[PDB]
Amino acid sequence: GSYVGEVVRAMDKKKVLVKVHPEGKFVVDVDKNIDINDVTPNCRVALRNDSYTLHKILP
Amino acid sequence: RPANHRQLTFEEIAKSAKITVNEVELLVMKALSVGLVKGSIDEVDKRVHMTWVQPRVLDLQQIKGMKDRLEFWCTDVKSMEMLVEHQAHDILT
Amino acid sequence: EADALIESLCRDKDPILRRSGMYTVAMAYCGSGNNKAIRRLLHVAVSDVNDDVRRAAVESLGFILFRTPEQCPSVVSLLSESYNPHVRYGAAMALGICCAGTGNKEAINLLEPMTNDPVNYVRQGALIASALIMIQQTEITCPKVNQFRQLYSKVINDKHDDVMAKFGAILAQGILDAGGHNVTISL
Amino acid sequence: MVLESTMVCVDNSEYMRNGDFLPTRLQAQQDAVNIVCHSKTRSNPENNVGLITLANDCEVLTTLTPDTGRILSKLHTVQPKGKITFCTGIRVAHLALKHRQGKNHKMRIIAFVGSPVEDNEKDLVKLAKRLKKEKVNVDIINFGEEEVNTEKLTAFVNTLNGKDGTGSHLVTVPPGPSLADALISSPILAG
Amino acid sequence: VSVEAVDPVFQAKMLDMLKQTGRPEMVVGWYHSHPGFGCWLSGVDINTQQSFEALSERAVAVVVDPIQSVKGKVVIDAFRLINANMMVLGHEPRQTTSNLGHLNKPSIQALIHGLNRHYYSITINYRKNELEQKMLLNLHKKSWMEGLTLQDYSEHCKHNESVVKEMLELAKNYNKAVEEEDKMTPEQLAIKNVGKQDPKRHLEEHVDVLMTSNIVQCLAAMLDTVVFK
Amino acid sequence: AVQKVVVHPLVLLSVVDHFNRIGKVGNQKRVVGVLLGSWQKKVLDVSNSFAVPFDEDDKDDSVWFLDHDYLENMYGMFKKVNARERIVGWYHTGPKLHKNDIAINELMKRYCPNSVLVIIDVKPKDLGLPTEAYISVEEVHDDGTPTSKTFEHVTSEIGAEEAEEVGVEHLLRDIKDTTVGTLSQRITNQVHGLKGLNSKLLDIRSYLEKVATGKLPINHQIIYQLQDVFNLLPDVSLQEFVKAFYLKTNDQMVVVYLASLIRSVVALHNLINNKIANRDAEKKEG
């Protein structure tokens, strides 16, 4: 499977800090087919568990 | 008799044994008491139906009849296998 | 002559030589003189488990059926999107060879599903098959701008596409450029 | 040095404990095995020695190996049964030479014969022709007698022996309270 | 796994015992298992690889890992070491780039390209001759067939009379238990007819129920053959 | 004592290796491999094996060549890597049981325990099962003939543990699985009479040859139980079994009503959609 990312803050260097499940907080560039600015902070997203690329915004 | 009315009667037994019909129930009870035969006869009117016994000695007529019914069974199973299989392989494969 | 030879070598245990019966049985049978070999070419195309004879299959079918441009892509139409990628790719070879030198749009209208797939094989031979038809063709006769621009978008899309896909892309782009439009091919 | 394989065929009949000759000369020829295997070890330590009897059911007691240390152990538990078997005693070694590791190791087979031979001259010439065919150095060592030692065994050797220059040697031991050891050390086969 | 784990006199001892048998082959590589943490190769692995590639220039390294590999696929890969002085030039000057479309099957998004620098791989194909093919084939068909093969036939022909009748009644219970659902369906089809909302199909299951029900028909003729001769 | 054995296909694939590592000499004898397995449970379970250089003579059967040191070294290193399996028995790949095989067997009856023998085939053209487990036991005979080592067949099954299934199934891609329904049932129902046909025809013809042209105790006694059990089916009169055919025929009638009714239910979506899709796409086409 894949994990559940939650961005709390977007970083301007296109390397988004994302709050992860404990021992997480993995700052990463998400996948190239998805822009960074669409990913709004303080919202939950869909993240792969190793490659740390975002799939979609979640409610 | 291998087939064709395997069922028999007490008259050939008592004629073989020069014994009365009062004693043939004792005779078949003894024959079942040895245990070489398992045959149990469901008759009301007196009959002798049989099952398994062991040949144990030799019979050349049952060697030849063995080859006869054996070969017959072989060509019947071959005949049905070719018979089903000819149209069967062509429609199913 | 070689009918017992190739039918004898078609029951080979060797998959390479099983392909070679088909590659061989092309040039004996070219000109669509045989409605026989199409049976076992397609039968080894669907039946066999190894995809070497299956992508190796339908090129001999184009090599016999090069006489009619019309009758080919209707019967490679299911093979355009096949089960495996390899019959897709060999189908791209078949539409490549049967429609080469022609103007038949019945291979051309099938390229728009061929140009977009997760497999780089069908993306590559989609451009190879696309390269073999558009040669010696004017736009005012036939609407080719779509395959022009998708043929052009790969050498800028070479950053995000596969390394073997771009090889057949620009290699396919030399085919229109061949001889400065002056020379062509004919079957 | 000398690159060759050594095969010994040993008597296990009850004819080897007879109170005329040496006190269980089975032990004496066992020590002859010890001095020839240690002498071959001193000449070329890589020579491999296999061990088998002349019984009805012959058994490879030790596969051919230069390690004779456990061959010393396998020379015991001799199982003194049976009388003799000549033909498959030959065939059980001469064709078993082809399993050897070092293929440059030449072919040498001896045999310790403590019983009269049960095979006729017709089998003696088939086997002597058989071994002269495949060209194996064969040294025949014959312990004890009831009849004369070599009457047909002589022509069995001469028809067995080809290659008159430095070929095989025959060992015929007389009666004597002297050992078998130095007496079979008298030819060049020990050396 | 270590270069110290390789006992060279035990290695060459077993090798020479293979040489006195019918095996005059040199080593072509060394393999191991990497369970759990993925098929890639540690520093110990790459260093004893670095030592064991001095003799053989090819020096194949293979990792079997059935622990997280499912029983559906037996995906195994043979791995390679690049030379460190080839970093200035292009990485792998391998011709004939057809099979690399098959070599992008190892596409896990951490290990292969997460660790692919200094560390590449090689394609795997097989070989099967006709003795392996028919020996293994009839071996496996026989592994799914019986001894005299007529043995378990009449067993299920007569379990059609003893056991499968219960499965036939239960089969009719799932059938009728869907028929109470399809009782309600022609009202829905008598109202909307636009779009489909149910992922349940009600058809192909019952086709399968008929296919299992036709075992009675197929084995009735089998009973006819046994009753015949 | 032991009812059945389990032989994994790995060792028979090593018999494919027996026919690989020959090197083309012209010998191709019954090359013996040292069978390994688990005698531990009452069932015998073969895991793996190896082979040993074995030579006989052309003329003499009773000359035979094995090795104890190779057995103890290969078995020693194998027990060093895996001590969960021990020596059990052996096998020759020849089709024929030689006279020598009691003596060749006797070496592994001594040093190993009661060893099992397996006859397999050099060419797998036999439709039957290639592997036959022959227990090496001495049995007392009713005729008074002296007791000898007798090879009674122990029934066998060929099974694979876990990964051998996966690797074999990946190597084939040709075999199909269980797949109940029409095909895998009906193919057994195609060739099945041929499978008892070639068995019986393969047996009774040369058996009938050994009837007239045979002597030397062919187990003449088991012919009496043989023909006896063969005459335990004296072409049944079916009179009681008539109602059994009413029973299977009435179950057949149940399959009739299920097939007719359920297929007729499948006709529904067909004979609705055939009209309502075509005429509406037609009437909104123009």
HEC states along F25-90?
CCCCCCCCEEEEEECCCCCEEECCEEECCCCECCCCCCCECCCCHHHHHHHHHHHHHCCCCEEEEE
Which residue, D69, D176, D171, is CA-closest to D112?
A: D171
How many contacts does C have with E, using Cβ atoms within 8 A?
14
- Is any Cβ of chain F less than 8 angstroms from the Cβ of E102? no
DSSP state of F147: P
Sole residue written with tokens 């290796």: F17
Cβ-proximal residues to F242 (8 Å cutoff; 6+ apart), any chain: none
Q: Is F72 on the interface with D (CB under 8 A)?
A: no
Which one of B75, B80, B81, B83 would you mutate to disrupt binding with E, by most E Cβ within 10 Å of its Cβ? B80
Smallest CA–CA separation between F185 and chain E, in Å? 8
**Backbone φ, ψ for residue B48 (5° rounding):** -130, 95
The half-sphere exposure of E188 on its side-chain side, counting CA atoms within 13 A, is 10
d(CA B3, CA E174): 48
Q: Please enumerate in sequence order all residues whose Cβ is within 8 A of that of F189, keeping only pairs 6 or more positions apart, or say none.
A: E218, E221, E222
Query: Would you state the structure tokens that stand for residue A33, as one six-digit string?
Result: 């087919």
* Residue whose C-alpha is closest to residue D168's, from D143, D142, D131: D131
Residues whose CB is less than 8 angstroms from the CB of residue C71 and which lie 6 or more positions away in sequence, other chains included: C65
Question: CB-based contacts of C22: which residues, under 8 Å, 6+ apart?
Answer: C41, C44, C53, C56, C57, C59, C60
Q: Do F189 and E227 touch (CB under 8 A)?
A: no
Residue labelled with tokens 């001193």: D42
DSSP state letter for D99: G
Cβ proximity of C55 and C91 under 8 Å: no
Residues in chain B: 93
Angle at the Cα of D84 from the Cα atoms of D78 and D90, rounded to 5 degrees: 95
Strand-strand pairing, F44-46 and F4-7: parallel
Which among F140, F142, F118, F138 is positioned nearest to F130, based on CA atoms? Answer: F118
Instruction: Give kind and range of the element (H or E) at residue C30.
Output: none
Tokens 């902070």: give the residue.
Answer: A41
Compute the count of residue pairs across chains D and F with CB atoms less than 8 Å apart. 34
- Strand order through the sheet with F148-158: F44-46, F4-7, F148-158, F132-139, F117-119, F86-92, F33-37, F49-51
Query: Could you give phi then psi for residue B3, rounded to 5 degrees?
Result: -140, -165
Biggest CA pair distance of chain F: 100
Give how far F70 is from chain D: nearest CA, Å: 9
Kindly state the tokens that stand for D20. 């005329």
User: How far is E183 from E178, CA to CA, in rounded Å?
Assistant: 8
In three-state secondary structure terms, D36 is helix
Which of C123, C91, C87 shows the shortest CA–CA distance to C107? C91
Q: Locate E137 and state its tokens.
A: 């084939």
F-chain residues within 8 Å CB-CB of E218? 185-186, 189
Go through A35-57 and write b for each residue having 16 or more CB atoms within 10 A of its CB, e for each that does not. ebeebeeeeebebbeeebbbeee
Q: Which residues contact D95 (CB under 8 A, 6 or more apart)?
A: F55, F57, F63, F65
* Residue A8: DSSP 8-state: S
CA distance A21 to A25: 8
Min Cα–Cα distance to chain C from E122, Å = 17
The helix/strand/coil state of F259 is: helix
Q: What does the block give as tokens for D83?
A: 């009388």
Six-digit token pair at F44?
Answer: 């015998």
CB contact under 8 A, F190 and B88: yes
DSSP letter at F3? -
Say if F163 is an interface residue toward chain E (CB within 8 Å).
yes
Query: What is the rounded CA–CA span in Å between residue E151 and residue D157?
Result: 65
Report the alpha-carbon distance of residue A36 to residue A29 in Å, rounded.
9
Radius of gyration of chain D (CA): 16
Q: Is E77 annotated as a binding residue?
A: no
Instruction: Give E117 to chain A, closest Cα distance, Å.
Output: 17
For residues A30 and A39, the answer to whether their CB atoms sit within 8 Å is yes
DSSP labels for A20-56?
A: -SSS--EEEPPPTTS-STTS-SSEEEEE-SSS--EEE
How is residue F234 annotated by DSSP? -
Question: Distance, in angstroms, between C103 CA and closest chain E CA?
Answer: 30
Q: Chain E contacts of A50, Cβ < 8 Å? A: 108-110, 114
Q: Which two tokens stand for residue A29?
A: 């560039």
The answer to whether E102 is annotated as binding is no
Q: Does C49 touch chain E (CB under 8 A)?
A: no
The Cα B32–Cα D49 span in angstroms is: 69
Cα–Cα distance measured from residue F61 to residue F76, given in angstroms and rounded to the nearest whole number: 30
Chain A residue numbers with beta carbons less than 8 Å from the beta carbon of E114 are: 50
Q: Which residues pair with F50 in a beta bridge?
A: F34
The pairing of strands F148-158 and F132-139 is: antiparallel
**H-helix segments, D9-163:** 25-43, 71-74, 87-94, 121-134, 152-160
Yes or no: say if D66 and D53 are a contact pair by the CB < 8 Å rule: no
F107–D99 C-beta distance less than 8 A:
no
B92: three-class secondary structure by DSSP: coil
- Please say whether the beta carbons of D8 and D111 come within 8 A: yes
The answer to whether the Cβ–Cβ distance between F234 and B3 falls below 8 Å is yes
Looking at beta carbons, which residues of chain C come within 8 Å of E100? 163-164
| Type and span of the H or E element at A16 | strand A16-18
Matching residue, tokens 């000695």: B57
Paired sense of beta strands F33-37 and F44-46, if any:
unpaired
Nearest to F93 by CA among F55, F44, F59, F131: F131
**Token duo for residue F274:** 């055939």
Please name the helix (run of DSSP H) or strand (run of DSSP E) that holds residue D106, with its range, or none: strand D106-113
Token pair belonging to E79:
């791995």
E102: CB partners within 8 A, 6+ apart: E123
Distance CA B82, CA F258 (A): 32
Chain C CB contacts of E98 under 8 Å are 164
Report CA dihedral (E160, E163, E164, E167) to the nearest 10 degrees. Answer: 170
Q: How many CB pairs under 8 A join E and F?
A: 157
Using CA atoms, how far apart are residues E157 and E164, in angstroms rounded to an integer? Answer: 9
Instruction: Judge contact between C57 and C91, C-beta under 8 A.
Output: no
Contact criterion met (CB < 8 Å) for B81 and F225: no
Cα-based angle B88, B90, C1 (whole degrees, multiple of 5):
155
The dihedrals phi and psi of F213, each to the nearest 5 degrees, come to -100, 15
State the Cα–Cα distance between residues B63 and B70, nearest whole angstrom: 10
Write the single-letter amino acid at D54. Answer: L
Quick check: A1 contacting E, CB < 8 Å? no
D-interface mutation test, from F31, F52, F68, most D Cβ less than 10 A away? F68
Whole-number Å distance between alpha carbons of C24 and C10: 11
Hey, are the CB atoms on F51 and E21 less than 8 Å from each other? yes
Pair D168, D139: CB distance under 8 Å:
yes
Closest Cβ opposite residue F67 in set D57, D63, D87: D63
Q: CA-CA distances (angstroms) from residue E212 to E215, F94, F247?
A: 6, 43, 19
F14-53 residues touching E, CB cutoff 8 A: 15-16, 19, 21-23, 51-53
The token pair that represents F43 in the structure block:
């069932």
- Can you give the three-state secondary structure of C138-184, one letter per residue? CCCCCCCHHHHHHHHCCCCHHHCCCHHHHHHHHHHHHHHCHHHHCCC
SS (H, E, C) F163-184: HHHHHHHHHHCCCCCCCCCCHH
Q: Please tell me if residue F111 touches chain D, with a CB cutoff of 8 Å.
A: no
The alpha-carbon gap from D62 to the nearest alpha carbon of chain F, in Å, equals: 7
Burial bucket for residue E155 (CB in 10 Å: 0-12, 13-18, 19+): exposed
CA dist., res. C95 & res. C109, Å (int): 11
Q: How far apart (Å, rounded) are the C-alpha atoms in residues F177 and E212?
A: 16
**F13 contact partners, CB below 8 Å, separation of at least 6:** E132, E135, E136
Closest-CA residue of F relative to B71 is F204
CA nearest neighbour of A52 among A9, A12, A10, A6: A6
For strands D106-113 and D137-142, give the pairing: parallel
The beta-carbon contacts of F105-114 under 8 Å, at least 24 apart in sequence, are: F105/F136, F105/F149, F106/D57, F106/F149, F107/D59, F107/F66, F108/F34, F109/F136, F109/F149, F111/F68, F111/F71, F112/F87, F112/F88, F113/F39, F113/F87, F113/F88
Does residue E34 have a known ligand-binding role?
A: yes
Residue E78, amino acid: A
Phi, psi of F36 (to 5 degrees): -120, 155
Q: Could you give the dihedral angle defined by the CA atoms of residues C12, C17, C21 and C26, in that order, rounded to the nearest 10 degrees? A: 170
Contact C164 E100 (CB under 8 A): yes
Q: Do chains B and E touch (3 or more CB pairs under 8 A)?
A: yes
Whole-angstrom Cα distance, residue E192 to residue D98? 89
Q: Tell me how far apart the alpha carbons of residues D29 and D113 are, in angstroms, rounded to a whole number.
A: 11
Distance between CA atoms of F18 and F93, rounded to whole angstroms? Answer: 9
Give the C-alpha distances (Å, rounded to integers) separating C150 from A32, C115, C154. 21, 8, 7
Task: Give SS3 for D62.
Answer: strand
Q: Tell me which residue of F8, F6, F4 sits closest to F160, measured CA to CA.
A: F8
Q: Does E196 touch chain F (CB under 8 A)?
A: no
Beta bridge partners, E62, equal E31, E78
Resolution (A): 4.5
Whole-number Å distance between alpha carbons of C16 and C51: 11
> Which of F55, F56, F63 to probe the D interface (max D CBs under 10 A)?
F63
8 Å CB contact of F57 and D95: yes
Distance from CA of F144 to the nearest CA of B (A): 16
Other CB atoms within 10 A of residue F258 CB = 20
Q: Are A8 and A17 in contact (CB under 8 A)?
A: yes
Chain B within 8 Å of F272 (Cβ-Cβ)?
Answer: no
Q: CA Rg, chain A, in Å?
A: 10
Cα nearest neighbour of A48 on chain E:
E109
Separation CA F141–CA F130 (nearest Å): 29
- Of residues E83, E72, E76, the one with CA closest to residue E61: E76
Within chain C, what is the greatest distance between any pair of CA atoms? 52
Q: Is A12 an 8 Å CB contact of chain E?
A: no
**Exposed, middle or buried, E128 (CB in 10 Å: 0-12/13-18/19+)?**
middle
Cα dist. F138→F3, F35, F102 in Å?
17, 21, 11
Technique behind the model: cryo-EM
- Secondary structure (H, E, C), chain E: CCCCCCCHHHHHHHHHHHHCCCCCCCCCEEEEECCCCCCCCCHHHHHHHHHHCCCCCCCEEEEECCCCCCCCCCCCEEEEECCHHHHCCCCCCCCCCCHHHCCCCCCCCCCCCCCCCCEEEECCCCCCCHHHHHHHHHHHHHHHCCCCCCCCHHHHHHHHHHCHHHHHHHHHHHHHHHHHHHCCHHHHCCCCCCCCCCCCCCCHHHHHHHHHHCHHHHHHHHHHHHHHC
Tell me the shortest Cα–Cα distance from A37 to chain E, in angstroms: 24
